[PDB]
Design a protein around this ligand. Sequence first.
Ligand code: MH0
Length: 183
Amino acid sequence: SISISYSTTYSGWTVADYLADWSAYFGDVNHRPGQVVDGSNTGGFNPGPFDGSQYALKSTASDAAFIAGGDLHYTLFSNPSHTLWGKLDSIALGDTLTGGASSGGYALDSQEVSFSNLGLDSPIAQGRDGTVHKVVYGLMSGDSSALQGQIDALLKAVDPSLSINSTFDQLAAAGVAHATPAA
Ligand code: MH0
């Protein structure tokens, strides 16, 4: 089942609350045609350059950041172009990236919430319509709807009473979430 870790700072928050709020701070890095010309809004893979167990990206509006974990692959200019696909196990959200390929891996200085054991696997054949692509490109572009939908489906798979409109606390009571110390 999905496993969620959250700082007790967000006790009382719903998952949807938090994601909407995080997305508001992160904004949109404008990773769009004609608007990616350097490393300021690409993010990066570990080990990379185009494949990794992690992909990480910091906001260009704030120091909000996320890390996607799993077995991940970006097609860049090969077909289907600009598609992230593969296995997505985790999404970790917070503030300020640290580390990298040459540091033992990426991490967040403040990791606020993470979602793991997502069990998502999108084949390259699905192109940008794959769930993995939609989830991560959504986050990059200021739209966490895809992530929210997937989390909601995973929670309801555990029990139909669970939701992204559940508080983190309720999800902990249900055995899916685990509180970590204040942020
Ligand atoms: C190797 C650097 C690099 C990384 C890392 C990178 C990471 C990501 N990308 Fe993405 N991306 C990179 C280099 C580009 C460029 C250079 C362009 C601009 C293409 C153009 O101007 O026609 C771009 N990406 C453009 C895109 C576009 C726009 C394509 C279009 O509308 O035609 C999407 C959807 C995209 N990416 C997805 C992603 C996703 C998802 C990730 C996360 C893995």
